[PDB]
Design an enzyme around this catalytic site. Structure first.
Site, PDB file in Angstrom:
ATOM      1  N   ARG A  62       0.871  -1.170   0.000  1.00 42.75           N
ATOM      2  CA  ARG A  62       0.000   0.000   0.000  1.00 42.75           C
ATOM      3  C   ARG A  62       0.903   1.214   0.000  1.00 42.75           C
ATOM      4  O   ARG A  62       1.673   1.404   0.929  1.00 42.75           O
ATOM      5  CB  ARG A  62      -0.947  -0.001   1.210  1.00 42.75           C
ATOM      6  CG  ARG A  62      -1.828   1.253   1.353  1.00 42.75           C
ATOM      7  CD  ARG A  62      -2.779   1.119   2.552  1.00 42.75           C
ATOM      8  NE  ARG A  62      -3.520   2.357   2.797  1.00 42.75           N
ATOM      9  CZ  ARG A  62      -3.579   3.009   3.947  1.00 42.75           C
ATOM     10  NH1 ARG A  62      -2.954   2.556   5.023  1.00 42.75           N
ATOM     11  NH2 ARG A  62      -4.302   4.121   4.017  1.00 42.75           N
ATOM     12  N   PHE A  94       2.283  10.829   0.854  1.00 41.00           N
ATOM     13  CA  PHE A  94       1.806  10.370   2.162  1.00 41.00           C
ATOM     14  C   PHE A  94       2.831   9.379   2.758  1.00 41.00           C
ATOM     15  O   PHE A  94       3.646   9.752   3.594  1.00 41.00           O
ATOM     16  CB  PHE A  94       0.379   9.819   2.076  1.00 41.00           C
ATOM     17  CG  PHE A  94      -0.178   9.258   3.382  1.00 41.00           C
ATOM     18  CD1 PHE A  94       0.314   9.648   4.610  1.00 41.00           C
ATOM     19  CD2 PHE A  94      -1.274   8.392   3.353  1.00 41.00           C
ATOM     20  CE1 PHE A  94      -0.222   9.141   5.788  1.00 41.00           C
ATOM     21  CE2 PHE A  94      -1.812   7.891   4.536  1.00 41.00           C
ATOM     22  CZ  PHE A  94      -1.278   8.270   5.748  1.00 41.00           C
ATOM     23  N   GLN A 125       3.737   1.703   2.784  1.00 42.36           N
ATOM     24  CA  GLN A 125       3.418   0.711   3.825  1.00 42.36           C
ATOM     25  C   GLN A 125       3.830  -0.712   3.393  1.00 42.36           C
ATOM     26  O   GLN A 125       3.614  -1.093   2.239  1.00 42.36           O
ATOM     27  CB  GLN A 125       1.922   0.730   4.153  1.00 42.36           C
ATOM     28  CG  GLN A 125       1.524  -0.232   5.260  1.00 42.36           C
ATOM     29  CD  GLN A 125       0.096  -0.033   5.701  1.00 42.36           C
ATOM     30  OE1 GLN A 125      -0.487   1.037   5.499  1.00 42.36           O
ATOM     31  NE2 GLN A 125      -0.488  -1.069   6.314  1.00 42.36           N
ATOM     32  N   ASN A 146      -1.276   0.063  12.197  1.00 38.69           N
ATOM     33  CA  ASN A 146      -2.117  -0.661  13.138  1.00 38.69           C
ATOM     34  C   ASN A 146      -3.585  -0.660  12.707  1.00 38.69           C
ATOM     35  O   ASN A 146      -3.941  -0.095  11.684  1.00 38.69           O
ATOM     36  CB  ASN A 146      -1.919  -0.121  14.560  1.00 38.69           C
ATOM     37  CG  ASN A 146      -2.447   1.295  14.737  1.00 38.69           C
ATOM     38  OD1 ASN A 146      -3.579   1.602  14.336  1.00 38.69           O
ATOM     39  ND2 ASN A 146      -1.652   2.161  15.339  1.00 38.69           N
ATOM     40  N   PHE A 196       5.187   1.690   8.162  1.00 35.91           N
ATOM     41  CA  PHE A 196       5.211   2.633   7.063  1.00 35.91           C
ATOM     42  C   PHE A 196       6.361   3.625   7.182  1.00 35.91           C
ATOM     43  O   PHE A 196       6.844   3.905   8.267  1.00 35.91           O
ATOM     44  CB  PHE A 196       3.847   3.311   6.850  1.00 35.91           C
ATOM     45  CG  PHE A 196       3.347   4.124   8.013  1.00 35.91           C
ATOM     46  CD1 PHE A 196       2.744   3.496   9.098  1.00 35.91           C
ATOM     47  CD2 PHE A 196       3.422   5.524   8.019  1.00 35.91           C
ATOM     48  CE1 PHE A 196       2.274   4.220  10.167  1.00 35.91           C
ATOM     49  CE2 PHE A 196       2.932   6.263   9.117  1.00 35.91           C
ATOM     50  CZ  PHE A 196       2.376   5.605  10.175  1.00 35.91           C
TER      51      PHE A 196
END
Length: 164
Positions: free
Chosen positions: A54, A59, A62, A101, A112
């Protein structure tokens, strides 16, 4: 001193290079130790061979779901999940290493690396390290994400371990 660990990352089967992470074992020893051991694989399981599943541009990137490879899985060296150790370190900017989490006290193996300051995660995700070297590789990984998180290349941690 604090451990240094590494992730060697491929995209579509070709190497991007190495990300080196310093783990703040002085601040979050339990969280740092879990990550360290998952990098070396010394418990018989860990990050080797797993993916960045992901990735959202501007941003974070992950990874760490080495059991289901999709964000639902992972386990810690202590058990399936472990508590939030503390929220002392903050999501200050690019290069921050923090635990993913599914709510309070649900740390496992997913993590991440931020590519921007993410202050709204302060008090919610346990920060436990930072990128020492390899932000170039992180930016490459980031460039293969999308708004939905879906990656446009297969991003694989081919090798990982401990430097010191």
């Amino acid at each position: 001193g604090n451990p240094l660990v590494y992730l060697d990352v491929d995209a579509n089967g070709k190497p991007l290079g190495r990300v080196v992470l310093e783990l703040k074992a002085d601040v979050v020893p339990k969280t740092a130790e879990n990550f360290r051991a998952l990098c070396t694989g010394e418990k018989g399981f860990g990050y080797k061979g797993s993916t960045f599943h992901r990735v959202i541009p501007s941003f974070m990137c992950q990874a760490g779901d080495f059991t289901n490879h999709n964000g639902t899985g992972g386990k810690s060296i202590y058990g399936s999940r472990f508590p939030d150790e503390n929220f002392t370190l903050k999501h200050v900017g690019p290069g921050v290493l923090s635990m993913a989490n599914a709510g309070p006290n649900t740390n496992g193996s997913q993590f991440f690396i931020c590519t921007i300051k993410t202050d709204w995660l302060d008090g919610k995700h346990v920060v436990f390290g930072h990128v020492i070297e390899g932000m170039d590789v992180v930016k490459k990984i980031e460039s293969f994400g999308s708004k939905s998180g879906r990656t446009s290349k297969k991003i694989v941690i081919t090798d990982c371990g401990q430097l010191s």
